[PDB]
């Protein structure tokens, strides 16, 4: 196919020096930056699971400038290689997304993939900047260990009683969950149609629509589901972002006390 789609232009910035396809890859002055920002990352980084003496894909780790060290400062050993290494995602990512626009713009297609992940590069920042930045400290930012993270996670978590109580937390799960099968159904629907019984003729658009009104007795044909799906998803991640940004900062107490706001008065 393609051959016709490999067609000069779409360049956000680069003008030309960038309109090209390392094979399967469309370079452009973001892959080019995407690069410069991943290298310089794992370079400084890889420099760290050394300094650590030990390493083990598993237990090579990176922590920021631990609390009261401050928001300001920190040094390419207590701070930095974390510090810097961070400024390499909140930028390498942002950098790619854009690589995402650039592919789009030209590719003909539309706006939204690049927006959707823009959330992801948005979950993260929260945890490693916002949260941090608000608690006048980067310590609630976190490790960078295939395995600590549970830990960094597992504590702050429990830092506030059984964290599965922070409301918004409550929620995001339940999108997280729903946007699940929400795929368990969609991913199963399109299928059965496309791929039916033994000899029956390939099914119909309204072949589907017909199932659901029968299981469920509504049903959101074609389009309505790709939006809805990109819904419960995109959402729930985000409703995550709220969870926290809010957790270290206007709820200082164990979560279980929230809940009383209800259980008070008459």
């Amino acid at each position: 196919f393609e051959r016709k789609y490999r067609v000069p232009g779409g360049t956000l910035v680069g003008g030309n020096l960038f309109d090209f396809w390392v094979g399967p890859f469309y370079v452009g002055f973001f892959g080019v930056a995407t690069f410069f920002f991943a290298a310089l990352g794992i370079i400084l980084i890889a420099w760290s699971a050394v300094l650590q003496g030990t390493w083990n894909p598993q237990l090579i780790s990176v922590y920021p400038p631990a609390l009261e060290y401050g928001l300001g400062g920190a040094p390419l050993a207590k701070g930095g290689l974390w510090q810097i290494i961070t400024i390499c995602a909140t930028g390498a990512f942002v950098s790619w997304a854009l690589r995402e626009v650039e592919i789009c713009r030209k590719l003909g297609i539309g706006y939204h993939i690049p927006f959707a992940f823009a959330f992801a590069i948005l979950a993260y920042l929260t945890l490693v900047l916002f949260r941090p930045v608000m608690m006048g400290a980067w310590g609630y930012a976190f490790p960078y260990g295939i395995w600590t993270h549970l830990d960094w996670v597992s504590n702050t978590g429990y830092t506030y009683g059984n964290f599965h109580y922070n409301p918004a937390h409550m929620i995001a799960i339940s999108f997280f969950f729903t946007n699940a099968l929400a795929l368990a159904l969609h991913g199963a629907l399109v299928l059965s149609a496309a791929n039916p019984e033994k000899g029956k003729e390939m099914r119909t658009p309204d072949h589907e629509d017909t199932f659901f009104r029968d299981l469920v007795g509504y049903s959101i044909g074609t389009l309505g589901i790709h939006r809805l799906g990109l819904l419960l998803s995109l959402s729930a991640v985000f409703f995550s972002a709220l969870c926290m940004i809010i957790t270290g900062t206007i709820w200082f107490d164990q979560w279980v006390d929230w809940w009383q706001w209800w259980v008070k008065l008459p």
């Binding site: 051959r3 490999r6 000069p8 090209f20 030209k106 119909t204 074609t222």
Partner: protein
């Protein structure tokens, strides 16, 4: 024990991935791929278990892994030297159908439906089809981008099944017509726009065959042109 669990699970996994999964991805997409890198740039699978389909009510048959190429005029040239290299369209691209523009060539048979309801008709042709909630593009003077307007709305060809406002007919000042896809266009109260597509042409809009029915190559041929606008229309950028 569970190491036998989690250790062989790691079979059901690698197992499926490059197996079934990616296997199927292949089924009927560059059932292998040439132009420079010959037989690949590494070590895929020599094309999976070829399977055949069942064309819907009306019959037909499609066998998926198939080598249906295209000597269907790619006005797509060369930029030089290596592959990955862009390839410039040999003149106003929007037409020759290349770049953003580029169509395809699905059948000269529109997607039927449940029955023969050729799925996508026009509002008149229709049964009891009107506007629950909305503004009505009809009589809605369609703008361009230019800002010199380029036509007057004449329908919204309705999708039966989804009951989908699929497209909106638009009659240029050659007392003529052409329909522009819905997910273009912005129905604002008093005015309309498939901004994508500067008025100051519009004409490009290929025609359909019979004025009741958008066949695949129609819709598809239609659908690009419009977009290429995105890519290839000066004002905008």
């Amino acid at each position: 024990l569970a190491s036998l669990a989690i250790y062989s699970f790691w079979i059901f996994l690698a197992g499926l991935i490059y197996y079934l999964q990616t296997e199927n991805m292949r089924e009927g997409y560059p059932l292998e791929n040439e132009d420079g890198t010959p037989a690949a740039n590494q070590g895929p699978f020599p094309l999976p278990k070829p399977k055949t389909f069942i064309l819907p009510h009306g019959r037909g048959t499609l066998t998926v892994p198939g080598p249906e190429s295209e000597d269907r005029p790619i006005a797509l040239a060369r930029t030089a030297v290596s592959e990955g290299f862009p390839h410039a369209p040999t003149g106003d691209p929007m037409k020759d159908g290349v770049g953003p523009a580029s169509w395809v060539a699905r059948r000269d048979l529109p997607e039927l439906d449940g029955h023969g309801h050729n799925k996508i008709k026009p509002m008149k042709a229709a049964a009891g089809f009107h506007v629950s909630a909305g503004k009505n593009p009809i009589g809605l003077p369609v703008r361009g981008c230019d800002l010199e307007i380029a036509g007057k709305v004449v329908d919204i060809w309705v999708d039966i099944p989804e009951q989908m406002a699929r497209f909106l007919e638009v009659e240029l000042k050659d007392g003529s017509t052409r329909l522009l896809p819905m997910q273009m266009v912005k129905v604002q109260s008093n005015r309309v726009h498939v901004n994508a597509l500067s008025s100051d042409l519009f004409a490009g809009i290929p025609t359909i065959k019979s004025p009741t029915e958008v066949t695949l190559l129609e819709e598809d041929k239609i659908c690009g042109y419009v977009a290429g606008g995105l890519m290839y229309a000066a004002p905008k950028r």
